[PDB]
Structure formats: structure tokens, C-alpha cells
């Protein structure tokens, strides 16, 4: 947030509002919606952007990802993920156990194929829970398994 005074003057100049999403006041809603017209004074209409040089943009792209394991990904998370792989194998089995039990009760209670059920989208939610979760658990056991050994000699 910012503030800038206007009072008398500041007119007979270039176009302040036309820049970014100004000329507003549908209902009272803008920003914090405690403002409407006056805001602090006159609706200075802040515009917040950012610009950086070629050196600054090159940094945060490669530097900032999640945390720093970088420069070698092989052995840093290898021992940590492999040690919990025995427990992960047992935890992913429970997720599959509750998968088909939802789809089994889904088609068992519907003999109609109409909507009295306020079920407007029933299947896609539970279908994605059995898909996206399955799609999440298998890819982390494959893509990581390729670099989990890579021993050669």
C-alpha cells in the first residue's frame, strides 16, 4: 500500500487513471473496500510492478527452487528417501485399500442414473482421488528409482 496527496492541482496533466485498472467503483468494492472514492485522498491508484537487469533475473531462476541440495542431486536425498522407502511401501498400500472401496459403494447405491442425489459431479472427484494419488505414488517410485542406483562401476 501507499499514499499520495493531491488536494488542489495535479490536474491539467497526463492521464493518471488510464494506466492500470482504474476508473472503478462498481458497487463500493475496491482493494480493502474501506476506501471507495477518497481512499486516503483522491484515489492515487497505486501501480506496483517490478523490473530487473539480466544479471538479477539469472540468479533467482536457478538459485530459488525449493531448498538447496543443488549441483548434485544423486546422493543428497538418496539415503534419506531410501531409508523411508520401507515405510513408504506400507503407507501407499493403505491408500489403494480405500480406493476401490469408494467406487464399490458408488455404483452399488445407484440403480437410477438420474439426479435426485445432489451428486452433480459425483464420479470425477472420487475418480481423481483414485487416479491423481495413484499418479503421484507411482512416479515418485520410478523417476527417483532411476537415480536411486545409477552405480555402474
Amino acid at each position: 500500500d501507499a499514499f499520495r496527496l493531491i488536494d488542489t492541482g495535479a490536474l491539467i496533466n497526463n492521464l493518471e487513471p488510464r494506466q492500470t485498472t482504474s476508473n472503478t467503483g462498481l458497487l463500493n468494492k475496491a482493494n480493502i473496500q474501506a476506501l471507495i472514492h477518497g481512499l486516503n485522498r483522491h484515489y492515487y491508484s497505486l501501480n506496483i510492478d517490478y523490473h530487473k537487469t539480466a544479471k538479477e533475473t539469472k540468479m533467482l531462476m536457478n538459485l530459488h527452487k525449493e531448498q538447496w541440495q543443488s549441483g548434485l542431486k544423486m546422493y543428497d536425498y538418496e539415503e534419506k528417501e531410501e531409508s523411508n522407502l520401507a515405510a513408504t511401501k506400507s503407507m501407499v498400500k493403505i491408500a489403494e485399500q480405500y480406493s476401490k472401496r469408494i467406487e464399490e459403494e458408488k455404483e452399488l447405491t445407484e440403480e437410477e442414473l438420474k439426479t435426485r442425489y445432489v451428486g452433480r459431479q459425483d464420479p470425477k472427484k472420487h475418480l481423481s482421488e483414485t487416479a491423481d494419488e495413484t499418479l503421484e505414488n507411482n512416479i515418485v517410485s520410478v523417476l527417483t528409482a532411476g537415480v536411486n542406483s545409477v552405480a555402474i562401476k
Binding site: 499418479l135 512416479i139 520410478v142 523417476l143 528409482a145 532411476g146 545409477v150 555402474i152
Partner: protein, 89 residues
């Protein structure tokens, strides 16, 4: 052609067999001619015995990344894991 077909069976079915039996099984009239057939078939010959070291097979025209490869075994295992990812993508 029958004796050549039997020779393919005698490799796997006989680990060690003497010289006198090969003459009787394949119906040979000479013992010296019996050893001559073993030279063209690459059969090791020792005293009163004939072994087979040729049970292991290789070559057979040209093959790459198929049918028990050699130096690509480590890569193909990792390649098969990367093929299913692109099918979904």
C-alpha cells in the same frame, strides 16, 4: 541331416560321453572318422571321453539392445522407466 540334427541334441542332453558310444549312437563305421566330425562341430576331446563346452551361445548375426545385451543392460532398465513417462505426457 539326421546325424547333424542328433548332434544338436547331444550337446544339451549329454554333459560327458565317451568316444565308443558316439560311434554306436550315430551309426559310425570308424572311430577315427568319429573324431573328425567332432572337429567341425568344435567338440573338446579328452582320453576316452568327449565333453561339450559349446552349450553357451553368442553371435547369431547382429543384435542390439535385445535378447540379453551386454553393456546396455544398465541403461535399458532405466530407459524402460522413461518410456512410460512420455506416454502419459
Amino acid at each position: 541331416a539326421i546325424r547333424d540334427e542328433i548332434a544338436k541334441n547331444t550337446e544339451l542332453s549329454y554333459d560327458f560321453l565317451p568316444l565308443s558310444n558316439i560311434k554306436a549312437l550315430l551309426f559310425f563305421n570308424n572311430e577315427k572318422e568319429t573324431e573328425k566330425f567332432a572337429l567341425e562341430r568344435n567338440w573338446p576331446i579328452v582320453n576316452s571321453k568327449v565333453y561339450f563346452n559349446n552349450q553357451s551361445k553368442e553371435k547369431a548375426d547382429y543384435e542390439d539392445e535385445m535378447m540379453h545385451e551386454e553393456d546396455q543392460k544398465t541403461n535399458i532398465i532405466e530407459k524402460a522407466m522413461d518410456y512410460a513417462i512420455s506416454i502419459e505426457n
